[PDB]
A paper describes a structure:
PTPN3 possesses three domains: an N-terminal FERM (band 4.1, ezrin, radixin, moesin) domain involved in localization to the cytoskeleton–membrane interface or interaction with transmembrane proteins, a central PDZ domain that mediates interaction with other proteins, and a C-terminal protein tyrosine phosphatase (PTP) domain bearing the catalytic activity. Finally, the C-terminal residues of the CTD form a non-canonical class I PDZ-binding motif (PBM) with a C-terminal cysteine (–ESQCCOOH; class I PBMs are defined as –[X–S/T–X–Φ], where Φ is any hydrophobic amino acid and X is any amino acid).
To decipher the molecular basis of recognition of the C-terminal sequence of HBc by PTPN3, we solved the crystal structure of the complex formed by PTPN3-PDZ and the PBM-HBc peptide (NH2RRRRSQSRESQCCOOH) by molecular replacement at 1.86 Å resolution. A clear electron density map was seen for the last eight C-terminal residues of PBM-HBc (underlined in the peptide sequence –RRRRSQSRESQCCOOH). PBM-HBc binds PTPN3-PDZ in a conventional way, inserting into a hydrophobic cleft formed by the β2-strand, the α2-helix, and the “GLGF” loop and pairing as an anti-parallel extension of the β2-strand, as observed for the PBM-16E6. Indeed, the backbone amide proton of the cysteine (C0) and the serine (S−2) and the backbone carbonyl oxygen of S−2 of the PBM-HBc are H-bonded to the β2 strand of PTPN3-PDZ through the backbone carbonyl oxygen of F523, L525, and the backbone amide proton of L525 respectively (black dashed lines in Fig. 1c). The side-chain of the C0 occupies the same position as the leucine side-chain in the complex with PBM-16E6. The space between the isoleucine 579 side-chain and the C0 permits to accommodate the cysteine side-chain in this hydrophobic environment without additional polar contacts to maintain its position. In position − 2, the hydroxyl group of the serine (S−2) forms a H-bond with the Nε2 of the conserved H572 from the α2 helix, as those we observed for T−2 in the PTPN3-PDZ/PBM-16E6 complex.
Author numbering:
A (entry chain A): 505 to 597
B (entry chain B): 1 to 8
Write the structure that this text describes.
């Protein structure tokens, strides 16, 4: 079927992970990766993030009922962290 | 807008 992948990303020198997001509970569209910036941290980790990946958890947090702006803040918040690491549980088709 | 796209 579809399946879950856990992806761990450390941001680059500018604090960017290298992907774009669309969706959120206010957008009436699920949260989904709309871009992978080539050679970015999100493109070079193993396993890597893919365009079209559906975001399920952000650092363990179920984000199904959070807004677009909220989840962008949750992602930025992972840089101000223990390991600076962002952990994305995603769903892939 | 309900079609926002944000860079992370
Ligand atoms: Br991979």
């Amino acid at each position: 079927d579809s399946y879950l992948v856990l992806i761990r990303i450390t941001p680059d020198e500018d604090g960017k992970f290298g992907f774009n997001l669309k969706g959120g509970v206010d957008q009436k569209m699920p949260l989904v990766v709309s871009r992978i910036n080539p050679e970015s941290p999100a493109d070079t980790c193993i396993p890597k993030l893919n365009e079209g990946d559906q975001i399920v958890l952000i650092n363990g947090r179920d984000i199904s009922e959070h807004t677009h702006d909220q989840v962008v803040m949750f992602i930025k918040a992972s840089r101000e962290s223990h390991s600076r690491e962002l952990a994305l549980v995603i769903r892939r088709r | 807008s309900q079609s926002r796209e944000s860079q992370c």
